[PDB]
């Protein structure tokens, strides 16, 4: 099951979402259980992974990953909420581009053996699950990169909410890999 375009659905019990601007080279493959693998290069913009839909406030995610990025790429819990429309990330690892760059710092949170700095950014007239919109992005960026472990979402959501970053109703919630004008390979197994 190799994707040929942006797509969503459920595979082996796990929701999957793959979004691509169709550029560059990419092969996103749905694999056994909660696993997926992706190989990419060129000048593409994409993000995809496996997880759940809808996401929940207290989900405890356990994942493993063989992550090998080259350029601007992220390995992170990724999802959206509506009312308000929010795109959020719990960055476990990243490439050459630090998501915190020029972002508004909103404190930090210690959870699952790690420490994460919190940030808020904004996307204007950008693609979203509701079409072209202007919305905020919330971030939890690990101070030390890792490619496997447990992520207690309640600790991140509560840290954001308390910092004044409101969350809406949950849309999807996945362990995603993202890339922008980058290359690499990744095999991620959720659950």
Catalytic site residue 92? no
25: CB partners within 8 A, 6+ apart: 40, 41, 42, 44
Report in angstroms how near the CB of residue 50 gets to Ca ion at its nearest: 11
Stretch that binds Ca ion, among 4-12, 17-25, 130-138, 168-176 (CB under 5 A): 4-12
Of 13 and 168, nearer to Ca ion (C-beta) is 13
User: Which stretch, 6-14, 87-95, 124-132, 142-150, contacts Ca ion (CB under 5 A)?
Assistant: 6-14
Establish if 1 lies at the interface with Ca ion (CB under 5 A): no
Give the number of residues in contact with Ca ion, rule: CB under 5 A. Answer: 1
CB of 32 to Ca ion, least distance (A): 12
Is 10 an interacting residue with respect to Ca ion (CB under 5 A)?
yes
- Strand 86-94 vs strand 133-142: parallel, antiparallel, or unpaired? parallel
Catalytic residue among 31, 87, 92, 130: 87
Determine whether 130 is an active site residue. Answer: no
Taking the alpha carbons at both ends of the chain, their separation in whole angstroms is 20
Query: Could you give the CA distance from residue 35 to residue 49 in angstroms, rounded to a whole number?
Result: 9
Burial 112-135 (b: 16+ CB within 10 A, else e): bebebbbbbbeeeeeebbeeeeeb
Q: In angstroms, what is the minimal distance from the CB of 13 to Ca ion? A: 5
Residues near 60 by beta carbon (within 8 Å), at least 6 away in sequence:
150, 151, 152, 153, 154
Residues lying near Ca ion in the complex (CB under 5 A) are found at 10
């Amino acid at each position: 099951q190799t994707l040929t375009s942006s797509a969503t659905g459920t595979h082996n019990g796990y929701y999957y979402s793959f979004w691509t601007d169709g550029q560059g080279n990419i092969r996103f493959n749905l694999e056994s259980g909660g696993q997926y693998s992706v190989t990419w290069s060129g000048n593409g913009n994409w993000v995809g992974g496996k997880g759940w839909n809808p996401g929940t406030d207290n989900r405890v995610i356990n994942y493993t990953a063989d992550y090998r990025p080259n350029g601007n790429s992220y390995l992170a819990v990724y999802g959206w909420t509506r009312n308000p429309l929010i795109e959020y990330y719990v960055v476990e690892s990243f490439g050459t581009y630090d998501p915190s760059t020029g972002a508004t710092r909103m404190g930090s949170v210690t959870t699952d053996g790690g420490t994460y700095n919190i940030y808020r950014t904004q996307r204007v007239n950008a693609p979203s699950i509701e079409g072209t919109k202007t919305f905020y992005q919330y971030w939890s960026v690990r101070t030390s990169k890792r490619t496997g472990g447990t992520v207690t979402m309640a600790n991140h959501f509560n840290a954001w909410r308390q910092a004044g970053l409101q969350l809406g109703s949950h849309d999807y919630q996945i362990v995603a890999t993202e890339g922008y004008y980058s290359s690499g390979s990744a095999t991620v197994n959720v659950g």
